[PDB]
Each structure stands twice: as C-alpha cells, then as structure tokens.
Write a protein that binds this ligand. Sequence first.
Ligand SMILES: Cc1cc2nc3c(=O)[nH]c(=O)nc-3n(C[C@H](O)[C@H](O)[C@H](O)COP(=O)(O)OP(=O)(O)OC[C@H]3O[C@@H](n4cnc5c(N)ncnc54)[C@H](O)[C@@H]3O)c2cc1C
Ligand SMILES: Cc1cc2nc3c(=O)[nH]c(=O)nc-3n(C[C@H](O)[C@H](O)[C@H](O)COP(=O)(O)OP(=O)(O)OC[C@H]3O[C@@H](n4cnc5c(N)ncnc54)[C@H](O)[C@@H]3O)c2cc1C
Lengths: 153, 153
Amino acid sequence: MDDRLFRNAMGKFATGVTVITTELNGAVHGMTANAFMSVSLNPKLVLVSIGEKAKMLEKIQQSKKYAVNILSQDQKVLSMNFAGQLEKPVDVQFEELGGLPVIKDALAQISCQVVNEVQAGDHTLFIGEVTDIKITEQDPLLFFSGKYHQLAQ
Amino acid sequence: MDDRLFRNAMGKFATGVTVITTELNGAVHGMTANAFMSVSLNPKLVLVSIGEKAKMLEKIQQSKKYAVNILSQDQKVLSMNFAGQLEKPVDVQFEELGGLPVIKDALAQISCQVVNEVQAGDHTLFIGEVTDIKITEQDPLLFFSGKYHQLAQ
Ligand SMILES: Cc1cc2nc3c(=O)[nH]c(=O)nc-3n(C[C@H](O)[C@H](O)[C@H](O)COP(=O)(O)OP(=O)(O)OC[C@H]3O[C@@H](n4cnc5c(N)ncnc54)[C@H](O)[C@@H]3O)c2cc1C
Ligand SMILES: Cc1cc2nc3c(=O)[nH]c(=O)nc-3n(C[C@H](O)[C@H](O)[C@H](O)COP(=O)(O)OP(=O)(O)OC[C@H]3O[C@@H](n4cnc5c(N)ncnc54)[C@H](O)[C@@H]3O)c2cc1C
C-alpha cells in the first residue's frame, strides 16, 4: 500500500475546515487545518495536528497558544488563502478572543492555551485548553475526498 | 463558559462518522466515534480518541489494535447501534482486514496497530499505524451540530 492509497483513504473522512491562528510579537499568523478534534470535557481540551514542515509549528511552540476558527460555507477563499493555494494574499479581517487573533464571521472561534505537545510521526499534536468560545448558526465549509463541499439542506 | 457551550462549539466542527472495531479473544467489539483524525504520512499514522468510561478503552489497551470503519450515508443505523442508542443490538456483517474485524460495505476500512497511548483529560488518544486499507466511492454519513447529515450533491 502506497502514499496515494493512504491519502485517498484519509480523504474519505469528511471534515469541517479551520484556520488555526496565533500571534507572535504583534504579527498574526494563520494556517488552514482540518486535522482538528474535540478531546476532553473535563478539562476542556482540543487538539490540532501540524506538519513538521509547517511554519506554524514553531510559531505555536513559541506563543504556546492558538485559536481554531471553524470556517463557514462562505469562507472557501479564506481556506485557500491560509493553505498557501492562492498566488495573491488576501486582506483578512481579524478580531480578538482570549488574547488571540480570530477571524471575523467564522462559524465558530475557539481560543486555546497549549497544555501538551506530542510528536507523532510527520506531525506534532498540540493539545489546547479552551479559554473562550464564540459560536454562530452558520452552515459549515466541508472537505471530503479532496474537494470542498456543503451540507445537504 | 458552560459544558453546554463547549459541547455546542465542538458540534460546530462537522465530521464523518466511524465505528472503531477490535477483536479480543474471539469476540468482536465496536464503538461509534467521530473523534478520529489522519495524523502522519511517514510513518502512516492515524488517531482515535476514546472516553475514559468507554468499554472500548480497555479493549484496545489489551488487543493493541483497532480498525476504523468510515460509515457511508446508508449506515446511520450502524452508527446508532455502536453508540449504544438501540435497545437491541442489530446483527452486523463483519469481514476481515489486517487481522481485524471490519464492517461490510463501509465507505472505507483502515486497520491499525497501536503504537502510542496518550491520556488527555477525559479521553485517551490511541495512535495507530495503518497496515491495511480498503476504499469505496460511497457518499459519507456526516455529523454536525448534534445531527446526522449528508453532503449536498
Ligand atoms: C482543507 C485543507 C486542510 C489542511 N489541513 C492541514 C492540517 O490539518 N495540518 C497541516 O499541517 N496542514 C494542513 N493543510 C495544509 C496547510 O494549510 C498548508 O500547507 C499551509 O500553507 C502551511 O502553512 P505554513 O505554516 O507552512 O505557512 P504558509 O505556507 O506561509 O501559510 C499559508 C498561507 O497563510 C497566509 N497567511 C498567514 N497569516 C496571514 C495573515 N495574517 N493575513 C493574511 N494571510 C495570512 C500566507 O499568506 C500563506 O499564503 C491543509 C490544507 C487544506 C487545503
Ligand atoms: C456520532 C457520535 C460520535 C461519537 N464519537 C465518540 C468518540 O469519538 N469517542 C468516544 O469515546 N465516544 C463517542 N461517541 C459515544 C459512544 O459511541 C458511546 O458512548 C458508546 O456506546 C460507548 O461504547 P462502549 O465501548 O462504552 O461499549 P457499549 O456502550 O456497550 O457500546 C455501544 C454498542 O455497541 C454495540 N456492539 C458492540 N459490539 C457489537 C457487535 N459485535 N455486534 C453488534 N453490536 C455490537 C453494543 O451492542 C452496544 O450497544 C459518539 C457517539 C455518536 C452518536
């Protein structure tokens, strides 16, 4: 079994789409991620998985904090932006939550403090304790089988 | 910030739906989970998150293996079954992959050997190296905001 078969399989697990944001000495950094998960209720924990070659990795290692911005159906362009897939950057509207930069109009905003780091092969798991949450009732951007998708209404 | 607000926020992250299966001395055990994630390409790693009160936790601890069965759109009843939501268990059709019981007609089947265990609050993360994969081109069962859903076609 090859890399292609593995990736194809992994893409059969449908997800939402997030942008992970953090702040390092004034500068806001973001990265598109769907490797995100709810972890624990007591205490309130979440986890994101970041590739070893992602610039975001060292950013979070330093800041020890991140926010997860769950993207609405209307935010596909943001997903592409923070995935490095547009030739031209976009001017993103940021607001603030729990001392973290968050994306305006996100489906949901979840601010976290890093409480654990676990290397796992290719990637590092950043376990975050949630300090602040903001929610809206928007429909979600989905990702499945290598494509963007929507919920059936 | 309540428990309710946290759970509501977590539900804002849409996912596919899996059944985690394992075998322990003849007996097949299954558990519905959406806290699943692709972790690493080299080596090929995956992760599932199991609640400390789940019977499945000790099952995996002992067998040191699990399969992830991604559920198709037609398998909502299976999801409810393995979530302890049916009064009487249905008779599930199992087949075999990499020495693990897997669910027939699943959207995808991914067999794993446990290579790490990480407690994280409420839950334990079982990191699994993938040995075998089977994929189909079915549409996925989705879970979002506490309800089952489908992709827009
Ligand atoms: C849907 C999908 C899911 C993905 N999931 C994951 C995953 O879970 N884990 C993982 O490691 N990778 C994931 N990726 C890949 C990842 O998003 C890209 O590899 C990303 O470009 C890597 O970011 P970086 O940290 O290396 O920095 P970069 O490659 O530079 O970051 C990407 C982009 O973010 C932009 N950006 C950063 N800050 C700002 C800002 N302040 N204002 C405007 N633009 C800004 C930059 O302009 C850049 O183009 C996913 C990609 C897709 C499309
Ligand atoms: C969509 C959704 C996502 C979920 N995600 C997670 C998650 O990621 N992590 C988590 O810990 N919990 C999750 N749960 C909750 C979890 O599925 C239930 O709490 C589950 O009942 C706990 O299983 P158990 O191991 O404690 O054993 P049980 O409570 O006994 O297992 C559940 C059911 O599986 C059935 N079953 C087991 N083996 C077989 C078999 N061989 N043939 C037929 N039936 C069988 C049993 O009859 C039982 O009814 C989720 C639930 C839902 C609905």
